[PDB]
Amino acid sequence: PLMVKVLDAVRGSPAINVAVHVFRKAADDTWEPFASGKTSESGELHGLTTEEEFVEGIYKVEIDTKSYWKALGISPFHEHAEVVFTANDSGPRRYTIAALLSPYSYSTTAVVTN
Amino acid sequence: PLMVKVLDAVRGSPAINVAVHVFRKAADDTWEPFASGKTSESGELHGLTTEEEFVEGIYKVEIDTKSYWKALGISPFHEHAEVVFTANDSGPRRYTIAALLSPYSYSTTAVVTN
Amino acid sequence: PLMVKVLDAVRGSPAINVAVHVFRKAADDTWEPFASGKTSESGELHGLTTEEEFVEGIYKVEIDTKSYWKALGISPFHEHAEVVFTANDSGPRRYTIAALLSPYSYSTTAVVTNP
Amino acid sequence: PLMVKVLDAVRGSPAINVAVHVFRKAADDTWEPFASGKTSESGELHGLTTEEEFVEGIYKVEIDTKSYWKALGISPFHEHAEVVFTANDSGPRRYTIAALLSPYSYSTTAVVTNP
Ligand SMILES: O=C(O)c1ccc2nc(-c3cc(Cl)cc(Cl)c3)oc2c1
Numbered sequence: 042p043l044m045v046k047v048l049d050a051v052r053g054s055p056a057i058n059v060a061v062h063v064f065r066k067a068a069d070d071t072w073e074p075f076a077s078g079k080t081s082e083s084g085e086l087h088g089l090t091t092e093e094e095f096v097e098g099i100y101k102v103e104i105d106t107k108s109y110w111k112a113l114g115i116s117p118f119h120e121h122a123e124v125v126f127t128a129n130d131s132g133p134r135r136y137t138i139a140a141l142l143s144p145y146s147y148s149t150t151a152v153v154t155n
Numbered sequence: 156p157l158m159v160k161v162l163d164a165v166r167g168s169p170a171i172n173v174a175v176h177v178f179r180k181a182a183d184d185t186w187e188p189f190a191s192g193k194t195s196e197s198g199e200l201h202g203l204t205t206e207e208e209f210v211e212g213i214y215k216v217e218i219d220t221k222s223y224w225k226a227l228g229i230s231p232f233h234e235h236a237e238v239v240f241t242a243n244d245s246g247p248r249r250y251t252i253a254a255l256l257s258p259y260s261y262s263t264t265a266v267v268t269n
Numbered sequence: 270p271l272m273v274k275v276l277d278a279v280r281g282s283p284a285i286n287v288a289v290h291v292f293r294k295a296a297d298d299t300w301e302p303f304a305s306g307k308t309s310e311s312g313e314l315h316g317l318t319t320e321e322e323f324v325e326g327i328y329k330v331e332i333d334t335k336s337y338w339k340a341l342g343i344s345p346f347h348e349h350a351e352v353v354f355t356a357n358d359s360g361p362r363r364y365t366i367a368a369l370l371s372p373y374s375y376s377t378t379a380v381v382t383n384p
Numbered sequence: 385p386l387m388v389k390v391l392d393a394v395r396g397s398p399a400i401n402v403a404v405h406v407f408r409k410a411a412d413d414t415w416e417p418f419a420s421g422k423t424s425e426s427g428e429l430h431g432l433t434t435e436e437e438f439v440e441g442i443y444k445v446e447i448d449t450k451s452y453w454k455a456l457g458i459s460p461f462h463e464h465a466e467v468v469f470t471a472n473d474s475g476p477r478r479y480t481i482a483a484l485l486s487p488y489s490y491s492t493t494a495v496v497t498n499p
Pocket residue numbers: 046048137139140141148149150152160162253254255262263264
């Protein structure tokens with residue numbers, strides 16, 4: 042139900058071995074760890090959650106862009122990239138969070154389908 | 156060797172049934188038709204060319220964004236979106252041209268892999 | 270020293286009346302409120318801070334995109350757009366944080382200049 | 385009435401010295417040269433045209449991204465970024481064409497205002 046895809050706008054490639062942490066907003070407004078992993082050779086991170094576990098709520102996807110750039114020997118601007126959204130059952134069932142990275146910029150979109 | 160992927164930033168979905176025309180720059184600097192099609196349900200257009208046919212050169216991918224928006228009842232800014240690039244054999248072999256559409260804006264990236 | 274500019278990719282216009290909250294990470298690792306404001310009719314927000322007050326630190330610029338879209342009667346995807354960066358760690362710089370908004374997408378860039 | 389602004393997503397800076405060529409589609413369906421210039425130290429290009437000369441039509445703003453990146457010693461993907469639009473068809477408007485550049489990607493947006 043949740044996939045993350047990360048692309049590199051400098052090299053024209055997937056962003057490989059990027060750490061990604063997913064959090065769920067708790068009742069007390071803190072961020073509780075939910076899922077994490079490293080992007081694959083295709084820039085994708087699958088297997089984060091199951092349908093059962095991915096209930097409605099507010100989620101944060103934190104992408105460790107700083108470490109990514111530093112490993113490539115590039116000084117970047119951001120500490121990380123955050124994508125914060127609500128999962129809503131009355132919309133489509135599968136969410137892809139995509140991010141396109143540059144050293145001083147990023148873009149993100151949602152692709153939400155059935 | 157060549158795939159096109161189109162996404163909709165308004166609806167958070169693939170951009171379905173978008174016409175795409177691919178041209179190759181000729182010796183006389185005109186644009187000769189090369190491949191075309193309509194994006195699928197996943198916003199993708201595969202099967203444009205083969206390895207044999209996709210030789211080095213300058214290519215233009217024209218995405219008919221205006222018709223896309225109009226079919227959704229939206230007035231858009233652009234006539235189309237153009238993506239013009241050189242295919243180079245000394246780089247990786249597979250090219251994905253991705254575009255993210257809004258009524259008054261678009262973004263494009265290349266994902267070039269082996 | 271800190272400017273925020275927001276554009277609307279649907280309307281082809283500045284994004285006007287967008288709420289922006291800036292935080293700075295404290296010693297104890299919490300996000301301390303630093304400054305806030307709203308974008309003007311030109312999509313710009315000036316006057317957030319001063320060179321004296323804008324010391325080195327890790328800053329978070331929270332652009333209230335959902336509030337913006339909801340005020341226009343649109344149901345958007347994201348809660349906000351958060352831009353987090355270290356500032357002034359090689360001495361004072363001027364920062365523009367720019368954002369381009371759509372209901373299911375945004376982009377952000379920084380322009381950093383040395384006065 | 386027509387302004388072009390270009391930013392560099394790698395440097396976090398204006399994109400300076402970017403060549404820009406504007407064309408207008410003629411009656412015979414060819415692209416006629418309309419105006420050209422280069423971005424300043426602020427990444428902006430002003431002075432392309434006048435309200436008299438900027439009549440209705442289909443315009444193409446060609447931003448010479450490859451030339452820009454090559455001048456910086458970088459091998460980029462695209463030849464240029466082309467922005468094609470109908471202008472002034474409901475009377476005169478002011479257009480800003482903005483672009484954000486990376487070596488393998490760009491984004492563009494328009495800001496259209498009615499004076
Ligand atoms: O879900 C997938 O497989 C898939 C593939 C290609 C994709 N290209 C993008 C993309 C492009 C631009 Cl120009 C800006 C942004 Cl934010 C994202 O997202 C993708 C997702």
